[PDB]
Write a protein that binds this DNA or RNA. Sequence first.
DNA 1: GCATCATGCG
DNA 2: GCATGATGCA
Length: 580
Amino acid sequence: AKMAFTLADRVTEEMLADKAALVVEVVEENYHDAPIVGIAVVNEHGRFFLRPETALADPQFVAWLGDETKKKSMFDSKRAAVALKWKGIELCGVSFDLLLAAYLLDPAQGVDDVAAAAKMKQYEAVRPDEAVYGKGAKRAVPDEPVLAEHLVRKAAAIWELERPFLDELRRNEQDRLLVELEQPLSSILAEMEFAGVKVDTKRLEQMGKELAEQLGTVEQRIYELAGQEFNINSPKQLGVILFEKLQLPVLKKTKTGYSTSADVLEKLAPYHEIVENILHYRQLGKLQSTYIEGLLKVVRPDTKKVHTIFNQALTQTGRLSSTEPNLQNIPIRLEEGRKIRQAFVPSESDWLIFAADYSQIELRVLAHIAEDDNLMEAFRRDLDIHTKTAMDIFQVSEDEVTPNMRRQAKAVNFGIVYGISDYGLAQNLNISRKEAAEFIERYFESFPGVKRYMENIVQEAKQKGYVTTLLHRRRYLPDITSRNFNVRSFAERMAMNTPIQGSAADIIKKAMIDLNARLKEERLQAHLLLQVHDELILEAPKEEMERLCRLVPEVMEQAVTLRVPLKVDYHYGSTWYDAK
DNA sequence: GCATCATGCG
DNA sequence: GCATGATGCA
Ligand SMILES: OC[C@H]1O[C@@](CO)(O[C@H]2O[C@H](CO)[C@@H](O)[C@H](O)[C@H]2O)[C@@H](O)[C@@H]1O
Ligand SMILES: OC[C@H]1O[C@@](CO)(O[C@H]2O[C@H](CO)[C@@H](O)[C@H](O)[C@H]2O)[C@@H](O)[C@@H]1O
Ligand SMILES: [Mg+2]
């Protein structure tokens, strides 16, 4: 049962073949400046295990790692690449990443280790990482004999599985998606994460002080209005104060009691002065806990930078996700929270932050896919799409569109991209199911192509078992055939939404690749820092702004060619906040 | 660890 | 529609 391999004490030529499955193991979940615990190499000559302090000090091995002509097959190459970057070592030649391959074949599998990807092809001669390392804090690196065999078995699985995975990707028409989009993007994300974003800690601390002061005042006021103290952060204790001691009406409940969601308190506001204070308390509380205290906990004490990790193989639609910290959900809606962005500054003196965002990319993608004449014309005229929708569904001229009409039309546009149900829209606009249904019907009468698309995509999902995006990303929807209305409807909404949200993801990902190629050709110092679904944030010398003002929008606008143009807005400033 | 709440794009 | 993080409670 045991797998044979050479536990080498030194690097040999045999280990430097031009094709190999490579494992550069980083156990710590956050791989930034993290230890490399072992290395495994499997190639035509055999299976090998190398101690990191040995291999990484070896000139020949380091050169092999950085030789683009020496191809390597790996699992989560970004993790290895970044861990190596922190050690001043360059990893090149990665031609196949099993994590990304598994992710494209089926995002729903949740593949997060070699064992999980291998099980997809009935290969089980490798143990799950959790089984070897354990979970929680009790997660430690085992003794060399156990560690070495595990790394070798993972390398062996990768070595064996590359062909079958590539073959299936090819069958799915996803070969270029892996090789020309996701794998090249992985390297770009690695550079972004490694570069990090500089944070003005002093600014954050000051804000923390001011918030703590405002919180104390709002908190005290709340007890003053309740006639007693209690844990406002406790939905249980709060519910007792609102619906029992204060007798506020119950407009909706929760599984474990009464509902105190923002959707509820907003309606209870007129009944008691305490509600507005609770909502405000929650706003400030979120800024203090997650964006002030939380951000400060992950800022590197020396460089004062934060190094997020973009999970490239998690979302069911093809989007990236961000953690430790999540730099894709920094406040911007409310001024008080938007101020947080003043804390994100350029990493060098005399540099500025440049941000470019796609304008209505999802609705433009919908116009393209549905080939709706009315919607395509609206974007060809670059009209305010919400005002346009209002004009159509409410049957009025532009001058007759009131602010309330535009607000409701905007809610309709948000919901249409995922076939929002009448109940879903009714809740968002706080109206009846019938009224919401009338809005939707009015929308379909004005945009018949979109109605046709929603009908056709659901049927396609049922016929094929999955839906696809512009660049051939796919998502299986087995629930589309369920006899349970709720479960089936949810699958139907996913069928309508995935091609839209997914294609928008495809487009910005390609723009990122195209952009880096352009920056390199022009030898600009500018570089990417973050991506937030519809936007790209970079930093660069103040002397490069004029060139970026022309280059970035163009690359993003020309990433793909649709039936409607793509529009990109951009801003730059001394801080992320100022890049508006 | 599940539930509820907040934040982002839409 | 798609995400992450902090909190309370058990
Ligand atoms: O390295 C990122 C890559 O690893 C996975 C597991 O294979 O996620 C791990 O690392 C993330 C970043 O620290 C953690 O959020 C996650 O909990 C941990 O398992 C993949 O999901 C990801 O693509
Ligand atoms: O009236 C048909 C209409 O209903 C939807 C759901 O909104 O689909 C239902 O009917 C289809 C048969 O035409 C089934 O395939 C599907 O499973 C069922 O939910 C729309 O897609 C369709 O336009
Ligand atoms: Mg935008």
